[PDB]
Amino acid sequence: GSSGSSGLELFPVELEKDEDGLGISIIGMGVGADAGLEKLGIFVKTVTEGGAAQRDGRIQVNDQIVEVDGISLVGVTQNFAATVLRNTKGNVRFVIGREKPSGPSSG
Known about the structure:
With 107 residues, the protein is mainly beta. The chain contains two helices and six strands; from the N terminus they run βββαββαβ.
């Protein structure tokens, strides 16, 4: 049983580009950095007040775009992610990763 524990809520989120594309910000972070085995994590720095991602409500700030329109934004430098978000078109499928629960909770 080698090391490994990946339990994140990966769900596809459709977004329709607007006069100003999506209208969301991303941040370049280093997830699980193991010297050189680090996996850059593209997170949502913020969401434009009244943007495509905002209006939607689905995508939130601090979110993690694991994938986009199928493109993987894992272990990739912001640049890459930036490029993707720049490649995106009208409709874009953002697969955010939310922390799943673990145990029975009341209300």
